[PDB]
Amino acid sequence: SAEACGYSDRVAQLTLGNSTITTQEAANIVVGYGRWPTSLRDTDATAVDKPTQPGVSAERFYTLPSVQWTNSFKGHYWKLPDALSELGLFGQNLQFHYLYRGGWVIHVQCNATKFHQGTLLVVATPEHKIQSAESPAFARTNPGEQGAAYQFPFTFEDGTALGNALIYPHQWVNLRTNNSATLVLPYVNALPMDSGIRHNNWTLSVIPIVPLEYAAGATTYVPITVTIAPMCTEYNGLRAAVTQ
Amino acid sequence: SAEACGYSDRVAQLTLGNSTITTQEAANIVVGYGRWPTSLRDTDATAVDKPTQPGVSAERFYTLPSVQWTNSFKGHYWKLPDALSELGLFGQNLQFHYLYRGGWVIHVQCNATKFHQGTLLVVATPEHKIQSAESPAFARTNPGEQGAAYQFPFTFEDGTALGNALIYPHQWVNLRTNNSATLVLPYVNALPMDSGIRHNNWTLSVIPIVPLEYAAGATTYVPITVTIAPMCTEYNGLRAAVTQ
Amino acid sequence: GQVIKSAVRSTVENTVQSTHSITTEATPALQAAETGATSNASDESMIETRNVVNTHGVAETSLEAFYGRAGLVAMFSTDGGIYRWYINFGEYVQLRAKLELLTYARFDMEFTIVAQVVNAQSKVQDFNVDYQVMFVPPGASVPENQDSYQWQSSCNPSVISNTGLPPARVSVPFMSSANAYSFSYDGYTQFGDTSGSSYGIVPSNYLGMLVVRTCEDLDGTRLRVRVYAKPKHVKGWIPRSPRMTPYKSRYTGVYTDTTKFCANRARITTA
Amino acid sequence: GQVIKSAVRSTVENTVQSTHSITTEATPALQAAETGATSNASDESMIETRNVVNTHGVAETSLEAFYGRAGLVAMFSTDGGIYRWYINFGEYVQLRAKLELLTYARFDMEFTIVAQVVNAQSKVQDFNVDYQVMFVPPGASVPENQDSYQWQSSCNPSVISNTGLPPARVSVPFMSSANAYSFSYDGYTQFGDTSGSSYGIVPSNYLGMLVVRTCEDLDGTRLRVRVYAKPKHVKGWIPRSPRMTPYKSRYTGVYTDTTKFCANRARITTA
Amino acid sequence: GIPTLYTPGSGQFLTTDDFQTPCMLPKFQPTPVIDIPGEVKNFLEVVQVESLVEINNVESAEGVARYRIPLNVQDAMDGQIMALRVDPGIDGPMQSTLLGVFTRYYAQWSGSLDFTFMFCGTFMTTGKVIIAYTPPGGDQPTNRRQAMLGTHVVWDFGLQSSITLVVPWISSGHFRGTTLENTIYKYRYYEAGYITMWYQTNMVVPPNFPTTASILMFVAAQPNFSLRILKDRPDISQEGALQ
Amino acid sequence: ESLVEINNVESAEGVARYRIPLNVQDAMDGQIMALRVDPGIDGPMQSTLLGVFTRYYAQWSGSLDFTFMFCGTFMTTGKVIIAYTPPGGDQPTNRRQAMLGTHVVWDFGLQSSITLVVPWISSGHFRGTTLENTIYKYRYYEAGYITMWYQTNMVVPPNFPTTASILMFVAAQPNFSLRILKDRPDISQEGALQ
Amino acid sequence: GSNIHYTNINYYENAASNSLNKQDFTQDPEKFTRPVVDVMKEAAVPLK
Amino acid sequence: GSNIHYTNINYYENAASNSLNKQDFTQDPEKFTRPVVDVMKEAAVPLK
Ligand SMILES: CCCCCCCCCCCCCCCCCC(=O)O
Ligand SMILES: CCCCCCCCCCCCCCCCCC(=O)O
Ligand SMILES: N[C@@H](CCC(=O)N[C@@H](CS)C(=O)NCC(=O)O)C(=O)O
Ligand SMILES: N[C@@H](CCC(=O)N[C@@H](CS)C(=O)NCC(=O)O)C(=O)O
Ligand SMILES: [K+]
Ligand SMILES: [K+]
Ligand SMILES: [K+]
Ligand SMILES: [K+]
Ligand SMILES: [K+]
Ligand SMILES: [K+]
Ligand SMILES: [K+]
Ligand SMILES: [K+]
């Protein structure tokens, strides 16, 4: 028994709405800042309209297009809620409302073989700015569901040290050990709610710190897949659909 | 006091979600078959997935494009849920789910003056078939938010007598008396839930039985407006968006 | 959410004696049809009435009393010793019009089959012959000939009788996949198709077909068959506006437009 | 030595509302078919479910409901006013395939006999004639002619009826010398013989024959007979893999090899 | 076997018979009865619902116009507006109503009738009209004076747009035949009388207002109404197989 | 559970028809298979235990258990997504559309199999077992589709087989039932048997 | 009219085999005749 | 469905003459679906 012996079982199942995700090579589960997603308290709220709480229609797993771990791969990132702004009813609720609040369950996938070696840092960063350019391009600050490739991994695209990104909720996908990372994230902001089309609360980054190598002749095509589920969401300020 | 004296007050306010509708010339409120909308009972349900209940995001008033009460006006009709299938989050939830169930609150509006005369039958008909043609056109069975003009009012487009449509929930907008009709409708079907893109449970018809006439020189342009709110809705069988 | 109650009664309402009324308070006669409500003016309020203990019953208008009798639903003659009848009640108008008085209804049915032999000139014969009526549910193989293997009927229900015996008769339960049959459907038979021929028909109302044959070959003659259906244990919902135009098609409610229902009279002032 | 219990149920299982699950502990979805066990992943564990009080019954799939109806087992015409039918259910495939769904089974049977007169051209006649169906157990003398002494039937059971009367019908008990009939037998009919024709048949399944005649001679015509059988009070053991190839012989399960069961489609990625 | 003696009627197929018979699917278990609004148990529930009378059934009126009783500013007094036999099952304006259709599915009827009228002129259009029910015995009343001697209501146009004239059940027998067919059955015996409408004062309007207006006519059975002896509705027929 | 004759294509004969082909990809998000979930219609399901009995009846109801077992080498890894698309439209055209429905993400490992439950999601309590359209218009009852896609990729060591197989199992769940017995269309004869 | 005494024993397994129902009552028609939210008493005016 | 009340008297000597059985229930299918010695709980992994 994992609880009795004091260890974490390498298998896991994540079930939300009509979706179930499984892995047989996990490395525990991270819960950002030790906090599970929670509803907005009456004492913290300011918007007075009764909120919409979509439930299972939006709180389920959405799988984004996979990314290849190429030989020159520097890493890839996705902004939240930006990446899911046009997916399913989560996207619709995000567009039709001025205000949105919610947490996340992130599952990053990358399997190879016992003949491959490589290590990916999987980190969820609050308020992660892509500020390496004098005038950041919208295509890079809000890359959508396809996400964007890293150009400056060592400086974390924001002028800080990549090695210190561990101060943010994270896990590693070290091929010899695991093939997936799972992170539960609570809503974080200096406000009770905010606009899902003007502000990205979190940024998911998958960065190779130890390059992908393997026994000569092994499969060279190794994808990285991201599956994300909104959790405990609520929306206020209903109107027509509006995207950034 | 209306209750004490046993009469119905001519003023009314309908508030659902972020919408409020008022009228100062109503003629009571009809509640179809004396039944308010209700949720699907565990003993009647068959679809096993936890349903989505959007709440205020979909249970609110949607106003459709107005229709003119022309001199040759034969009447107009709208299918439900067809008419709102592409409006707001109600439309989105209807499209993203295989199954839908819900009631309605209908408010038909038509004001003129004490110098005008005319009478409209406002009726909500369950399973109203537009079968006057050997092969009914999709444009007429599912006219969308614009609705469709009547071509055969006397036969109610279905081979029955217009005068007997009173067996269905209805009211009249008799200009000398009132300028609006309000009807609350429960979900009706031979099934617990059904597809919102293949079956229209109700059809709202506004038919002139006494032509619009007025003192010479009065305003001749008199619109008819329909405002409809889904009520007590639930959806099952989530997937990608699909329209008929 | 039912706000209007429905107490049951076994007799019509009595009349209670009433007297004159001269007041500004009670005005039973004043009404307003715009509300959608039928007048609530009672006999006793409109005229001075006497006491009438009215024991008139209401039984013959109950759904069971109205629908609870047999009506013709099929009539045909075999060809090559066989006939395939798709179970539907749109062929013969009398029972059809009755059923369309309700939107939804649950009921069991009693089917009665009357058959006799007729010759090529359609003259009835005094000839006793064994016949078989097999119910073939959708998806099951339909026999092509009078002697095909499907007549073994090891699973399909079959009733074998003789033209010399009384009419055959069997009861069937409420078989729809739905929770009630629908006699009005404003929708299509399938997703991805909006052709007119797929409109206004609810597939769940079609439970299959009845295939009929004579067990052995008749010599130059044919089997004439009439199928009657009687609804039983009727439960109904949502009364409908009655058919007011002639039927034209077996599967659709298409009709010919008209400018009047009743015939004209010389003037509105002469009864 | 029964380690697995078999509690009875009269309705299918309900659905109970469930919520999300994010853990490393419970993994209902992970399975291992190698064990020989069917997955035990429940609906509630794979998705978030709602409460569903499911009152759907299970009656029509019970052995009694599945087998409890008549099916054709014999069909023939007399020759010289007589016909000998060896009792076996391999001639007509529908009932045969049903029975082979079980390895062993005990049941009583209701036999129904439908008979009529036909002429040399196989045209049915309206002619009432008395006929006799005699059950001749193995070892008893089988009549060679329509008027042989065995028809006295002082011990053999016989049923005499008329083509003008309703079909004859009699029940028979579970008659095998075994404790159940066998619908699959991997063995031989006797010791000292290993010929292929003696393989796959359990002799105890054969209880004798039915010999039929008209009590008196028909003039130029023949008696057409159909025998139906209906299992009753069924008890069954060891479900079997269903027949998936056409039958070819009455006494053996021989078949023609095939490279596919269902028809082909263009590609595995297009439903 | 128990000795029995079969009797006349044996083997017959009476369409209204009521016996128990073997079921084709003895172990079949139907879908559950779910909650559906609008359950009806007796058609008396339907005939008590008001529906429009096709009252203006004249050559010049087509379709929807046939439901409108014409009213107009008079230049003479005590004039007539309309007339109709009250019998719910005979051919005429009543035959296409809910009440009429069901009455036509039966041979006999009984009960008071609710005739309600709704004025549809402008808010400024006034008027008083008298609606009378004349019990049988003679012909329809020839003038307002004769009509007012019977059961009647005087209607004043105003905020409450409608008025109800109850045609009370006044009959020699407890029931009446639904047809008045005379040539064969001499059922004219059952005629229930007439309903007529007359100007009590006049329809009056302001300058340049429409000088014509309409009244819609509704009819329904009262709570003491019932029907007996089911029969095929004469309006439903066919001359051959349907397409 | 019994095997679905899933690879019912011209190039597959006999036993090979039970194997869903899988192979090392050089592109992402690709499709692996598709199938209508209806248990009683002609196709891969007709020869299964579930299919045979469903074909002995006119109506069915209940959730379905579709279990898959990976049969590649111990060193062969991979992640695949299996989705159930409730009715309304056509089968999903790509992985993004498919994942919006009911689904499970399967990770190849020690536990060789995964179960995708196709929950009973229907307007009516029962569905017809056939989708025959010309006569009865039963396409009305279509239960939807099950599709499988590469979530990541099948990955193998040097010189390992670059192709592998998945076996597909199906069975009724505990809330499944059948109504109205009918003769199985697969059993027939043209004359007396030898 | 209907007998106050008569035999009513079912000989068959399924309810579908049973003879016709013998209730035949009617119910208050208000759900069809007066499906309104506000009560409008007979003695008062309908609208004010 | 089936009647809660119906006559069930046997007129004949031998049980083979009796009408069909009226039980029709189903039993837990574990002897066919999970004929294994070791219990493998739904929430755990099958093999370790
Ligand atoms: C073997 C005995 C034969 C007896 C006939 C059995 C018929 C089974 C079918 C029962 C279905 C009847 C309900 C159909 C109602 C819908 C009709 C329609 O909409 O056209
Ligand atoms: C005189 C009345 C005649 C009625 C017929 C009596 C028939 C007696 C034989 C009963 C045996 C039936 C069970 C046979 C089952 C095995 C069939 C097979 O394997 O082919
Ligand atoms: N004369 C033709 C056609 C008769 C026919 O189809 N009649 C229809 C009405 S048009 C019917 O309902 N007949 C009732 C019956 O004969 O029982 C025939 O007898 O074959
Ligand atoms: N046509 C021949 C042969 C017919 C025959 O044997 N038919 C087989 C199937 S090939 C059957 O099962 N018939 C069923 C029946 O007639 O009851 C005849 O009638 O003598
Ligand atoms: K909710
Ligand atoms: K909610
Ligand atoms: K009374
Ligand atoms: K009043
Ligand atoms: K009334
Ligand atoms: K249950
Ligand atoms: K498990
Ligand atoms: K299972």
TrEMBL record, chains A, B:
Compartment(s): Host cytoplasmic vesicle membrane; Host nucleus; Virion
Protein purpose: Localizes the viral replication complex to the surface of membranous vesicles. It inhibits host cell endoplasmic reticulum-to-Golgi apparatus transport and causes the disassembly of the Golgi complex, possibly through GBF1 interaction. This would result in depletion of MHC, trail receptors and IFN receptors at the host cell surface. Plays an essential role in viral RNA replication by recruiting ACBD3 and PI4KB at the viral replication sites, thereby allowing the formation of the rearranged membranous structures where viral replication takes place.
Subunit structure: Homohexamer; forms a hexameric ring structure with 6-fold symmetry characteristic of AAA+ ATPases. Interacts (via N-terminus) with host RTN3 (via reticulon domain); this interaction is important for viral replication. Interacts with capsid protein VP3; this interaction may be important for virion morphogenesis.
The family this protein is said to belong to: Belongs to the picornaviruses polyprotein family.
Protein name: Genome polyprotein
Natural source organism: Enterovirus F
From TrEMBL, chains C, D:
Localization terms from the record: Host cytoplasmic vesicle membrane; Host nucleus; Virion
Superkingdom, taxonomy of origin: Viruses
Position of the signal peptide: none
Residues binding glutathione, per UniProt: D147, Q152, R213, R226
Family: Belongs to the picornaviruses polyprotein family.
Subunit structure: Homohexamer; forms a hexameric ring structure with 6-fold symmetry characteristic of AAA+ ATPases. Interacts (via N-terminus) with host RTN3 (via reticulon domain); this interaction is important for viral replication. Interacts with capsid protein VP3; this interaction may be important for virion morphogenesis. Interacts with RNA-directed RNA polymerase.
Function, as annotated: Localizes the viral replication complex to the surface of membranous vesicles. It inhibits host cell endoplasmic reticulum-to-Golgi apparatus transport and causes the disassembly of the Golgi complex, possibly through GBF1 interaction. This would result in depletion of MHC, trail receptors and IFN receptors at the host cell surface. Plays an essential role in viral RNA replication by recruiting ACBD3 and PI4KB at the viral replication sites, thereby allowing the formation of the rearranged membranous structures where viral replication takes place. Protein 3A: Localizes the viral replication complex to the surface of membranous vesicles. It inhibits host cell endoplasmic reticulum-to-Golgi apparatus transport and causes the disassembly of the Golgi complex, possibly through GBF1 interaction. This would result in depletion of MHC, trail receptors and IFN receptors at the host cell surface.
Name listed for the protein in its UniProt record: Genome polyprotein
Origin species: Enterovirus F
Residues of the full protein shown: 562 to 832 of 2166
